[PDB]
Amino acid sequence: VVIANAHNEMIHDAVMDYYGKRMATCSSDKTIKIFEVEGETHKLIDTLTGHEGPVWRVDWAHPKFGTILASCSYDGKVMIWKEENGRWSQIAVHAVHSASVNSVQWAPHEYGPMLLVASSDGKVSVVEFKENGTTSPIIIDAHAIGVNSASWAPATESRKFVTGGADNLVKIWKYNSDAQTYVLESTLEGHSDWVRDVAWSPTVLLRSYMASVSQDRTCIIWTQDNEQGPWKKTLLKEEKFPDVLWRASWSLSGNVLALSGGDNKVTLWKENLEGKWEPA
């Protein structure tokens, strides 16, 4: 179902609506594109523009609040646009960070219309969209050099999300009505280089599963069982993948690992009966 040459500039992200019927591509050309996919067809609708620097990542909001797609660019700003009347418009612009923003994912509709922003400005922001338009932002420093990922943890307070460091550190953050904002929990060390990406699973089974990919060219699957329980570092393999590792994605169900390399190859992984990993 290829959509050959969607952009002019190299593409940095390919995400779909909750109903895999409409896509969203973003590139360096500072532009994002909306799509329609059927059997093998690709209808190109609008092309989102207002981004000064290369767009990095984008994320589809839950249909619960209509059609909304958020994008983050080098321009140190993340922007969201809705699709009222089949015509794409820019609803709000979030630019609190001072430097590139490399990741932006939406919170489980349960939580609400929340967006988690992680900038290379070393900080991270949490923003929910009220009514009138003016939101109440929440920012908290998260890493030394910077921040590269900010995946969320499923619903359960009890609001958690993992961060990937520019300083090689993976962290866990849980809300706190007494602290007024998300505070640190874990600080799982493991990578020798920078944490390129970290995604948290929705697999509600007995134990929690977290993925961490990095310039150190390895994935460390962080498995923990309960509050007490510490996270068990686990090398996806006791060798190095020839190139870096940029993305890690969790399948809806069946909990399978989508590990987008850098050697330009995508690999899939599963945890056999023991607790190790194998292809698919």
Side-chain angles (χ1 to χ4, degrees), residues 21-89:
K21 201 180 191 303
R22 149 199 305 167
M23 186 170 50
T25 57
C26 81
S27 177
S28 311
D29 46 31
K30 299 137 270 177
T31 60
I32 337 168
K33 301 185 173 307
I34 297 295
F35 281 68
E36 296 309 301
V37 210
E38 287 308 313
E40 284 210 311
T41 65
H42 33 298
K43 170 196 175 185
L44 168 42
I45 302 61
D46 266 318
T47 288
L48 306 160
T49 321
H51 266 282
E52 303 186 310
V55 171
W56 290 137
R57 190 179 327 186
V58 296
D59 201 60
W60 283 116
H62 206 293
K64 182 177 178 178
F65 342 77
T67 297
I68 300 184
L69 174 57
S71 60
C72 59
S73 176
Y74 192 58
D75 68 356
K77 313 185 293 190
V78 286
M79 294 170 246
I80 49 284
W81 352 56
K82 292 195 189 189
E83 199 216 68
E84 183 182 304
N85 302 303
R87 276 180 172 177
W88 284 100
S89 40

Coordinates of all heavy atoms in Angstrom, one line a residue, residues 21-89:
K21 N -7.4 4.9 8.6 CA -8.1 5.2 7.3 C -7.5 6.5 6.8 O -7.6 6.9 5.6 CB -9.6 5.4 7.5 CG -10.4 5.3 6.2 CD -11.9 5.4 6.4 CE -12.7 5.0 5.2 NZ -12.3 5.8 3.9
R22 N -6.9 7.3 7.7 CA -6.3 8.6 7.4 C -4.8 8.6 8.0 O -4.7 8.3 9.2 CB -7.2 9.7 7.9 CG -6.5 10.9 8.4 CD -7.4 11.7 9.3 NE -8.7 11.9 8.7 CZ -9.8 12.3 9.3 NH1 -9.7 12.6 10.6 NH2 -10.9 12.6 8.7
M23 N -3.8 9.0 7.2 CA -2.5 9.0 7.7 C -2.0 10.4 8.1 O -2.8 11.3 8.3 CB -1.5 8.4 6.7 CG -0.1 8.3 7.2 SD 0.9 7.4 6.0 CE 0.5 8.2 4.5
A24 N -0.7 10.6 8.2 CA -0.1 11.9 8.5 C 1.4 11.8 8.4 O 2.1 11.0 9.1 CB -0.4 12.4 9.9
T25 N 2.0 12.5 7.4 CA 3.5 12.5 7.1 C 4.1 13.8 7.4 O 3.5 14.9 7.2 CB 3.8 12.1 5.7 OG1 3.1 13.0 4.8 CG2 3.4 10.7 5.3
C26 N 5.3 13.8 8.0 CA 6.0 15.1 8.3 C 7.4 14.9 7.8 O 8.0 13.8 7.9 CB 5.9 15.4 9.8 SG 7.1 14.5 10.7
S27 N 8.0 16.0 7.3 CA 9.4 16.0 6.8 C 10.2 17.2 7.3 O 9.7 18.0 8.1 CB 9.4 15.9 5.3 OG 10.7 16.0 4.8
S28 N 11.3 17.4 6.6 CA 12.2 18.5 6.9 C 11.7 19.8 6.1 O 11.9 20.9 6.6 CB 13.6 18.2 6.3 OG 14.1 16.9 6.8
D29 N 11.0 19.5 5.0 CA 10.4 20.7 4.3 C 9.5 21.4 5.2 O 8.7 22.3 4.8 CB 9.7 20.2 3.1 CG 8.8 19.0 3.3 OD1 8.2 18.9 4.5 OD2 8.6 18.2 2.4
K30 N 9.5 21.2 6.5 CA 8.7 21.9 7.4 C 7.2 21.7 7.2 O 6.4 22.5 7.7 CB 9.1 23.4 7.3 CG 10.6 23.7 7.7 CD 11.2 24.7 6.7 CE 11.9 24.0 5.5 NZ 12.4 25.0 4.6
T31 N 6.9 20.7 6.4 CA 5.4 20.5 6.2 C 4.9 19.1 6.5 O 5.7 18.1 6.3 CB 5.1 20.8 4.7 OG1 5.9 19.9 3.9 CG2 5.4 22.2 4.4
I32 N 3.7 19.0 6.9 CA 3.0 17.8 7.2 C 1.9 17.5 6.2 O 1.3 18.5 5.7 CB 2.4 17.8 8.6 CG1 3.1 18.9 9.5 CG2 2.5 16.5 9.3 CD1 2.4 19.2 10.7
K33 N 1.6 16.3 6.0 CA 0.5 15.9 5.1 C -0.5 14.9 5.6 O -0.2 14.0 6.4 CB 1.1 15.4 3.8 CG 2.1 16.3 3.1 CD 2.6 15.8 1.7 CE 3.4 16.8 0.9 NZ 2.6 18.1 0.8
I34 N -1.8 15.2 5.3 CA -2.9 14.3 5.8 C -3.2 13.3 4.6 O -3.1 13.7 3.5 CB -4.1 15.1 6.1 CG1 -3.8 16.1 7.3 CG2 -5.3 14.2 6.5 CD1 -3.5 15.4 8.6
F35 N -3.6 12.1 5.0 CA -4.0 11.2 3.9 C -5.2 10.3 4.1 O -5.8 10.3 5.2 CB -2.8 10.3 3.6 CG -1.7 10.9 2.8 CD1 -1.0 11.9 3.2 CD2 -1.5 10.4 1.5 CE1 0.0 12.5 2.5 CE2 -0.5 11.0 0.7 CZ 0.3 12.0 1.2
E36 N -5.5 9.6 3.1 CA -6.6 8.6 3.1 C -6.1 7.4 2.4 O -5.4 7.4 1.4 CB -7.8 9.2 2.2 CG -8.4 10.4 2.7 CD -8.8 10.3 4.2 OE1 -9.6 9.4 4.5 OE2 -8.3 11.1 5.0
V37 N -6.2 6.3 3.1 CA -5.7 5.0 2.7 C -6.8 3.9 2.5 O -7.5 3.6 3.5 CB -4.6 4.5 3.6 CG1 -3.6 3.7 2.8 CG2 -3.9 5.7 4.3
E38 N -6.9 3.3 1.3 CA -7.9 2.2 1.1 C -7.3 1.1 0.2 O -7.0 1.4 -1.0 CB -9.1 2.8 0.5 CG -10.0 3.6 1.5 CD -10.3 2.8 2.7 OE1 -10.6 1.6 2.6 OE2 -10.1 3.4 3.8
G39 N -7.2 -0.1 0.7 CA -6.8 -1.2 -0.1 C -5.4 -1.1 -0.7 O -4.6 -2.0 -0.6
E40 N -5.1 0.1 -1.3 CA -3.8 0.5 -1.9 C -3.9 1.9 -2.3 O -2.9 2.4 -2.9 CB -3.5 -0.4 -3.1 CG -3.1 -1.8 -2.7 CD -2.1 -2.4 -3.8 OE1 -2.4 -2.3 -5.0 OE2 -1.0 -2.9 -3.4
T41 N -5.0 2.6 -2.1 CA -5.1 4.0 -2.5 C -4.7 5.0 -1.5 O -4.8 4.8 -0.3 CB -6.6 4.3 -2.9 OG1 -7.4 4.2 -1.7 CG2 -7.1 3.3 -3.9
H42 N -4.2 6.1 -2.0 CA -3.7 7.2 -1.2 C -4.1 8.6 -1.7 O -3.5 9.2 -2.6 CB -2.2 7.2 -1.0 CG -1.4 6.6 -2.2 ND1 -1.6 5.4 -2.7 CD2 -0.4 7.2 -2.9 CE1 -0.8 5.1 -3.7 NE2 0.0 6.2 -3.8
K43 N -5.2 9.1 -1.1 CA -5.7 10.4 -1.5 C -5.0 11.5 -0.6 O -5.1 11.4 0.6 CB -7.2 10.5 -1.2 CG -7.8 11.9 -1.4 CD -9.2 12.0 -0.7 CE -9.8 13.4 -0.7 NZ -11.1 13.5 0.0
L44 N -4.4 12.4 -1.2 CA -3.7 13.5 -0.5 C -4.6 14.7 -0.3 O -5.1 15.2 -1.2 CB -2.4 13.9 -1.2 CG -1.6 15.2 -0.8 CD1 -1.5 15.3 0.7 CD2 -0.3 15.2 -1.5
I45 N -4.8 15.0 1.0 CA -5.7 16.1 1.3 C -4.7 17.3 1.6 O -3.7 17.4 1.0 CB -6.6 15.9 2.6 CG1 -7.4 14.6 2.4 CG2 -7.5 17.0 2.9 CD1 -6.7 13.4 2.2
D46 N -5.1 18.1 2.6 CA -4.3 19.3 2.9 C -2.8 19.0 3.2 O -2.3 17.8 3.1 CB -4.8 19.9 4.2 CG -5.7 21.1 4.0 OD1 -5.5 21.9 3.1 OD2 -6.8 21.2 4.7
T47 N -2.0 20.1 3.4 CA -0.6 20.0 3.7 C -0.4 21.1 4.7 O -0.5 22.3 4.5 CB 0.3 20.4 2.4 OG1 0.3 19.3 1.5 CG2 1.7 20.6 2.8
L48 N -0.2 20.7 6.0 CA 0.0 21.6 7.1 C 1.3 22.4 7.1 O 2.4 21.9 6.9 CB 0.0 20.7 8.4 CG -1.2 19.8 8.6 CD1 -0.8 18.7 9.6 CD2 -2.4 20.6 9.1
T49 N 1.1 23.7 7.2 CA 2.3 24.6 7.1 C 2.2 25.8 8.1 O 1.2 26.5 8.2 CB 2.6 25.1 5.7 OG1 2.3 24.1 4.8 CG2 4.0 25.5 5.6
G50 N 3.3 26.1 8.8 CA 3.5 27.2 9.7 C 4.7 26.9 10.6 O 5.0 27.6 11.5
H51 N 5.3 25.8 10.2 CA 6.5 25.3 10.9 C 7.8 25.8 10.2 O 8.0 25.6 9.1 CB 6.6 23.7 10.8 CG 6.0 23.0 12.0 ND1 6.7 22.9 13.2 CD2 4.8 22.4 12.1 CE1 5.9 22.2 14.0 NE2 4.8 21.9 13.4
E52 N 8.6 26.5 11.0 CA 9.8 27.2 10.5 C 10.9 26.2 10.2 O 11.6 26.3 9.2 CB 10.2 28.3 11.4 CG 9.2 29.4 11.6 CD 9.7 30.6 12.3 OE1 10.3 30.3 13.4 OE2 9.5 31.7 11.9
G53 N 11.1 25.3 11.1 CA 12.2 24.3 11.0 C 11.7 22.9 10.7 O 10.5 22.7 10.6
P54 N 12.6 21.9 10.5 CA 12.1 20.6 10.2 C 11.2 20.0 11.2 O 11.4 20.1 12.4 CB 13.4 19.8 10.0 CG 14.4 20.8 9.6 CD 14.0 22.0 10.4
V55 N 10.1 19.4 10.7 CA 9.1 18.8 11.6 C 9.7 17.4 12.0 O 10.3 16.7 11.2 CB 7.8 18.5 10.9 CG1 6.9 17.7 11.7 CG2 7.1 19.8 10.6
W56 N 9.5 17.1 13.3 CA 10.1 15.9 13.8 C 9.2 14.7 13.9 O 9.3 13.7 13.2 CB 10.8 16.1 15.1 CG 12.1 17.0 15.0 CD1 12.4 18.0 15.9 CD2 13.2 16.8 14.1 NE1 13.7 18.5 15.5 CE2 14.1 17.8 14.4 CE3 13.4 16.0 13.0 CZ2 15.3 18.0 13.7 CZ3 14.6 16.1 12.3 CH2 15.5 17.1 12.6
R57 N 8.2 14.8 14.8 CA 7.3 13.8 15.0 C 5.9 14.4 15.1 O 5.7 15.6 15.4 CB 7.6 13.0 16.3 CG 6.8 11.7 16.5 CD 7.3 11.1 17.8 NE 8.7 11.3 18.0 CZ 9.5 10.8 18.9 NH1 8.9 9.9 19.8 NH2 10.7 11.1 19.1
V58 N 4.8 13.5 14.9 CA 3.5 13.9 15.0 C 2.6 12.8 15.6 O 3.0 11.7 15.7 CB 2.9 14.3 13.6 CG1 3.6 15.5 13.0 CG2 3.1 13.1 12.6
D59 N 1.4 13.2 16.2 CA 0.6 12.2 16.8 C -0.9 12.5 16.8 O -1.3 13.6 17.2 CB 1.0 12.0 18.3 CG 0.6 10.7 18.9 OD1 1.0 9.6 18.3 OD2 -0.1 10.7 19.9
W60 N -1.6 11.5 16.4 CA -3.1 11.6 16.2 C -3.8 11.5 17.6 O -3.6 10.6 18.4 CB -3.6 10.4 15.4 CG -3.4 10.7 13.9 CD1 -2.6 10.0 13.1 CD2 -4.1 11.6 13.1 NE1 -2.7 10.4 11.8 CE2 -3.6 11.4 11.8 CE3 -5.0 12.6 13.4 CZ2 -4.1 12.2 10.7 CZ3 -5.5 13.4 12.3 CH2 -5.0 13.2 11.0
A61 N -4.7 12.5 17.8 CA -5.5 12.5 19.1 C -6.6 11.5 19.0 O -7.0 11.1 17.9 CB -6.0 13.9 19.3
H62 N -7.2 11.2 20.1 CA -8.3 10.2 20.1 C -9.5 10.9 19.5 O -9.8 12.1 19.7 CB -8.7 9.8 21.6 CG -9.3 8.5 21.7 ND1 -10.6 8.2 21.2 CD2 -8.9 7.3 22.2 CE1 -10.9 7.0 21.4 NE2 -9.9 6.4 22.0
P63 N -10.2 10.1 18.6 CA -11.4 10.6 17.9 C -12.4 11.2 18.9 O -13.3 12.1 18.5 CB -12.0 9.3 17.3 CG -10.7 8.5 17.0 CD -10.0 8.7 18.3
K64 N -12.3 10.9 20.1 CA -13.1 11.4 21.2 C -13.3 12.9 21.2 O -14.3 13.5 21.5 CB -12.5 10.9 22.5 CG -13.3 11.3 23.8 CD -12.6 10.7 25.0 CE -13.3 11.2 26.3 NZ -12.6 10.6 27.5
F65 N -12.2 13.6 20.7 CA -12.2 15.1 20.6 C -12.1 15.5 19.2 O -11.6 16.6 18.9 CB -11.0 15.7 21.4 CG -10.4 14.7 22.4 CD1 -9.5 13.7 22.0 CD2 -10.6 14.9 23.7 CE1 -9.0 12.8 22.9 CE2 -10.1 14.0 24.7 CZ -9.3 13.0 24.2
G66 N -12.6 14.6 18.3 CA -12.6 14.9 16.8 C -11.3 14.5 16.2 O -10.6 13.6 16.6
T67 N -11.0 15.2 15.0 CA -9.8 14.9 14.3 C -8.7 16.0 14.6 O -8.9 17.2 14.3 CB -10.0 14.9 12.8 OG1 -10.9 13.8 12.5 CG2 -8.7 14.7 12.1
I68 N -7.7 15.6 15.3 CA -6.6 16.4 15.7 C -5.3 15.7 15.5 O -5.2 14.5 15.8 CB -6.8 16.9 17.1 CG1 -8.1 17.6 17.3 CG2 -5.6 17.8 17.6 CD1 -8.4 18.2 18.7
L69 N -4.3 16.4 15.0 CA -2.9 15.9 14.7 C -2.0 16.9 15.3 O -2.1 18.1 14.9 CB -2.7 15.7 13.2 CG -1.4 15.2 12.7 CD1 -0.9 13.9 13.3 CD2 -1.5 15.1 11.2
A70 N -1.0 16.5 16.1 CA 0.0 17.4 16.7 C 1.3 17.1 16.0 O 1.7 16.0 15.8 CB 0.0 17.3 18.2
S71 N 2.1 18.2 15.8 CA 3.4 18.2 15.2 C 4.4 19.0 16.0 O 4.0 20.0 16.7 CB 3.4 18.7 13.8 OG 3.0 20.0 13.7
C72 N 5.6 18.5 16.1 CA 6.7 19.2 16.8 C 7.8 19.4 15.8 O 8.1 18.5 15.0 CB 7.2 18.4 18.0 SG 7.8 16.8 17.5
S73 N 8.5 20.6 15.8 CA 9.6 20.8 14.9 C 10.8 21.3 15.6 O 10.8 21.6 16.8 CB 9.2 21.9 13.9 OG 10.3 22.2 13.0
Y74 N 11.9 21.5 14.9 CA 13.2 22.0 15.4 C 12.9 23.4 15.9 O 13.5 23.8 16.9 CB 14.2 22.0 14.2 CG 15.6 22.2 14.7 CD1 16.2 21.4 15.6 CD2 16.4 23.3 14.2 CE1 17.6 21.5 16.0 CE2 17.7 23.5 14.6 CZ 18.3 22.6 15.5 OH 19.6 22.8 16.0
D75 N 12.0 24.1 15.2 CA 11.6 25.4 15.6 C 11.2 25.7 17.0 O 10.7 26.8 17.4 CB 10.5 25.9 14.6 CG 9.1 25.2 14.8 OD1 9.1 24.2 15.6 OD2 8.1 25.6 14.1
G76 N 11.4 24.6 17.9 CA 11.1 24.7 19.3 C 9.6 24.9 19.6 O 9.2 25.4 20.7
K77 N 8.8 24.5 18.6 CA 7.3 24.6 18.8 C 6.6 23.4 18.3 O 7.0 22.7 17.3 CB 6.9 25.9 18.0 CG 7.7 27.1 18.2 CD 7.1 28.3 17.5 CE 7.2 28.2 16.0 NZ 6.8 29.5 15.3
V78 N 5.5 23.1 19.0 CA 4.6 22.0 18.6 C 3.3 22.6 18.3 O 2.9 23.6 19.0 CB 4.4 21.0 19.8 CG1 5.6 20.1 20.0 CG2 4.0 21.7 21.0
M79 N 2.7 22.2 17.2 CA 1.4 22.7 16.8 C 0.4 21.7 16.6 O 0.7 20.6 16.1 CB 1.6 23.5 15.5 CG 2.5 24.7 15.7 SD 2.8 25.4 14.1 CE 4.6 25.1 14.0
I80 N -0.9 22.0 16.9 CA -2.0 21.1 16.6 C -3.0 21.8 15.7 O -3.1 23.0 15.7 CB -2.7 20.7 17.9 CG1 -3.1 21.9 18.8 CG2 -1.9 19.7 18.7 CD1 -1.9 22.5 19.5
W81 N -3.6 20.9 14.9 CA -4.6 21.4 13.9 C -5.8 20.5 13.8 O -5.6 19.2 13.8 CB -3.9 21.5 12.5 CG -2.4 21.3 12.4 CD1 -1.7 20.2 12.9 CD2 -1.5 22.2 11.8 NE1 -0.4 20.3 12.6 CE2 -0.2 21.5 12.0 CE3 -1.5 23.4 11.2 CZ2 1.0 22.1 11.5 CZ3 -0.3 24.0 10.8 CH2 0.9 23.3 10.9
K82 N -7.0 21.0 13.8 CA -8.2 20.2 13.8 C -8.7 20.1 12.3 O -8.1 20.8 11.4 CB -9.3 20.7 14.7 CG -9.0 20.6 16.2 CD -10.2 20.8 17.1 CE -9.8 20.9 18.6 NZ -10.9 20.8 19.5
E83 N -9.8 19.4 12.1 CA -10.3 19.2 10.7 C -11.8 19.5 10.6 O -12.5 18.7 10.0 CB -10.0 17.8 10.2 CG -10.1 17.7 8.7 CD -10.6 16.4 8.2 OE1 -11.8 16.2 8.5 OE2 -9.9 15.6 7.6
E84 N -12.3 20.6 11.3 CA -13.7 20.9 11.2 C -14.2 21.3 9.8 O -13.7 22.2 9.2 CB -14.0 22.1 12.1 CG -15.5 22.5 12.2 CD -15.8 23.7 13.1 OE1 -15.4 23.7 14.3 OE2 -16.4 24.7 12.6
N85 N -15.1 20.5 9.3 CA -15.7 20.6 8.0 C -14.9 20.1 6.9 O -15.1 20.5 5.7 CB -16.0 22.1 7.7 CG -16.9 22.8 8.8 OD1 -18.1 22.3 9.0 ND2 -16.5 23.8 9.4
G86 N -14.0 19.1 7.2 CA -13.2 18.5 6.1 C -12.1 19.4 5.7 O -11.3 19.0 4.8
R87 N -11.9 20.6 6.3 CA -10.9 21.5 6.0 C -9.9 21.8 7.2 O -10.4 22.3 8.2 CB -11.5 22.9 5.6 CG -11.9 23.0 4.1 CD -12.5 24.3 3.8 NE -12.7 24.5 2.4 CZ -13.3 25.6 1.8 NH1 -13.7 26.6 2.6 NH2 -13.4 25.6 0.5
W88 N -8.7 21.5 7.0 CA -7.6 21.6 8.0 C -7.2 23.0 8.4 O -6.7 23.8 7.5 CB -6.4 20.8 7.7 CG -6.6 19.3 7.9 CD1 -6.9 18.4 7.0 CD2 -6.4 18.6 9.1 NE1 -6.9 17.1 7.5 CE2 -6.6 17.3 8.9 CE3 -6.1 19.0 10.4 CZ2 -6.5 16.3 9.9 CZ3 -6.0 18.1 11.4 CH2 -6.2 16.7 11.1
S89 N -7.3 23.3 9.6 CA -6.9 24.7 10.2 C -6.0 24.5 11.4 O -6.1 23.5 12.1 CB -8.2 25.4 10.5 OG -9.2 24.6 11.1

